Design a protein around this nucleic acid. Structure first.
Ligand code: ZN
Ligand code: ZN
Lengths: 49, 72, 404
RNA sequence: GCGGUAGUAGCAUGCUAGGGAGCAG
RNA sequence: AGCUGCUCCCUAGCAUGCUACUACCG
């Protein structure tokens, strides 16, 4: 029990860690792309007014 | 015998393209048309005419050191 | 094309061409010899006059008080009518003609012979200048109704110039059939997105509110809000996918390589994309040759290759859209063919699904323009929650998003 | 001598996930 | 740099299933 159970504690803790790592990176890339397209939208109108 | 010249024309156009020959639209159009016309040929005496015309393009510029690759 | 004797006789009797045209073997074809359109369009005015005289005949029948069925085979190619052998007589002012087989059978010939081309001429004179329409006018709703009342006057079905007011899908087909014809009179710069200036955070944008279509008429968005404070992800997506601000802010373009109407040039120099030749796998070729393959006079020989192309290959191939003409279909028959075709699809089931039930195989495929400057489809399927996608979907049920 | 759980090793199936490649419209 | 459909191959994880043998109880 207490030497094979905690052999799964680390398993599930590490997979939770990697899933939240990837969620953090996927939430940063969203911010990067929205900044990029906002920059495009605002630089495109500075040619027509 | 015609399959030989068709594969050879494929290799020749690939070499020409590696030598940055598509930087001049006139030359690239000429070579592209000669190549596609060789691949559709159906008598091995026209293919050799267009092959000598196509190889003249490589023999023109001096980028490939011919005397070396001709060590036989 | 084996026996088209009466067509030849008709084409030369009214000086559409001359007998030496029919020795150009392939004269009938459409994609080779695309000049047959110019010789068909020379029958346009005989057909226009036929339509006008059938309206006159319908009016005379209505007033005089006669009831009968008009058929095509009772009208010579001048326009005059005859054969009154099955008409019956009722009280005047209350006669009624029946034009259903006439008009619906005739319909496909009105766009082959371009019969209404004399209506974009100064009076309707083929000898006068064109009508100079206004450049900012995009809603020709009364001219459609006037054309309908001039040519198809006794066609008893309701015609909605804008199919937004239609009653089902068969009514949509019926009214778009007429829009297809009438839209060949108006200027081709009045179709497309309908931009309009909005303000967000005290800055003006130009964005499409809804599009005018050749088949569907005018369509206006329902949730268009002037004066906004900030844009969410979804609104950034729907304002970066529109062609409004891309085409409003680029150089004007005149491309004489194509006949397709060219809008704008998004940057200062045109790009010519080529195609390379394949690679030779010499080991397999040698191996095949060493076992008796490719000997001269054999059954199997090499005919599939990698063909290379030069710069004028993308546009010279896009120009094949010149083969799409404005066809107007026979509607009383299409409205039966559609029922049988639908009966062929009776053992399935469909409907809407939520964003958490879609299946996307291969999320590494490009995302179109302009989204392919920032990532593939994975980036836009990860950056939107299951509520941004659902907001988007439920948004396109009330608005029109044109794309590129 | 057998029933119950807990094991390891081995086996098959099925399903998800990931990657590579081929054909068809 | 597209939308689909089918097929082969490799890897991973999980549960299920299956079987053998070992430890505890009944
Ligand atoms: Zn309608
Ligand atoms: Zn639905």
């Amino acid at each position: 029990r207490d030497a094979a159970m905690q052999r799964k504690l680390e398993k599930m803790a590490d997979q939770a860690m990697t899933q939240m790592y990837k969620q953090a990176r996927s939430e940063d890339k969203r911010a990067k792309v929205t900044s990029a397209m906002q920059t495009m939208l605002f630089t495109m109108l500075r040619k027509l007014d | 015998k015609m399959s030989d010249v068709k594969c050879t024309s494929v290799v020749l156009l690939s070499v020409l393209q590696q030598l940055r020959v598509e930087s001049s639209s006139k030359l690239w159009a000429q070579c592209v048309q000669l190549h596609n016309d060789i691949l559709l040929a159906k008598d091995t005496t026209e293919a050799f005419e267009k092959m000598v015309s196509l190889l003249s393009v490589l023999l023109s510029m001096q980028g490939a050191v011919d005397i070396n690759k001709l060590c036989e | 094309e084996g026996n088209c004797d009466t067509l030849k006789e008709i084409l030369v009797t009214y000086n559409c061409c001359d007998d030496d045209y029919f020795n150009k073997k392939d004269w009938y074809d459409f994609v080779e010899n695309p000049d047959i359109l110019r010789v068909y369009a020379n029958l346009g005015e005989r057909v226009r006059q036929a339509l006008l005289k059938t309206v006159q005949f319908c009016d005379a029948m209505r007033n005089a008080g006669i009831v009968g069925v008009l058929t095509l085979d009772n009208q010579d190619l001048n326009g005059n009518w005859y054969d009154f052998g099955d008409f019956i007589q009722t009280t005047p002012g209350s006669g009624v003609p029946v034009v259903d087989s006439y008009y619906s059978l005739l319909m496909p010939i009105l766009t082959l012979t371009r019969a209404l081309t004399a209506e974009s001429h100064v009076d309707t004179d083929l000898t006068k200048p064109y009508i100079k329409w206004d450049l900012l006018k995009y809603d020709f709703t009364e001219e459609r109704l006037k054309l309908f009342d001039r040519y198809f006057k006794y066609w008893d079905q309701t015609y909605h110039p804008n199919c937004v007011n239609c009653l089902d899908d068969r009514c949509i087909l019926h009214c778009a059939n007429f829009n297809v014809l009438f839209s060949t009179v108006f200027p081709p710069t009045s179709f497309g997105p309908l931009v309009r200036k909005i303000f967000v955070d005290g800055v003006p944008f130009v964005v499409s509110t809804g599009y005018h279509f050749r088949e569907l008429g005018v369509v206006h968005n329902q949730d268009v809000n002037l004066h906004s404070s900030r844009l969410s992800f979804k609104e950034l997506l729907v304002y970066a996918a529109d062609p409004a601000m891309h085409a409003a802010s680029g150089n004007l373009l005149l491309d004489k390589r194509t006949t397709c109407f060219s809008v704008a040039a998004l940057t200062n120099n045109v790009a010519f994309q080529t195609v390379k030749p394949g690679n030779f796998n010499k080991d397999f070729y040698d191996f095949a040759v060493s076992k008796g393959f490719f000997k001269e006079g054999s059954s199997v020989e090499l005919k599939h290759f990698f063909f290379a192309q030069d710069g004028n290959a993308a546009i010279s191939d896009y120009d094949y859209y010149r083969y799409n003409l404005p066809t107007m279909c026979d509607i009383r028959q299409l409205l039966f063919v559609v029922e049988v075709v639908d009966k062929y699809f009776d053992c399935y089931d469909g409907g809407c699904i939520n964003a958490n039930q879609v299946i996307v195989n291969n999320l590494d495929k490009s995302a179109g323009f302009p989204f392919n400057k920032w990532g593939k489809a994975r980036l836009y399927y990860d950056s939107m929650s299951y509520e941004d996608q659902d907001a988007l979907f439920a948004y396109t049920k009330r608005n029109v998003i044109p794309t590129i």
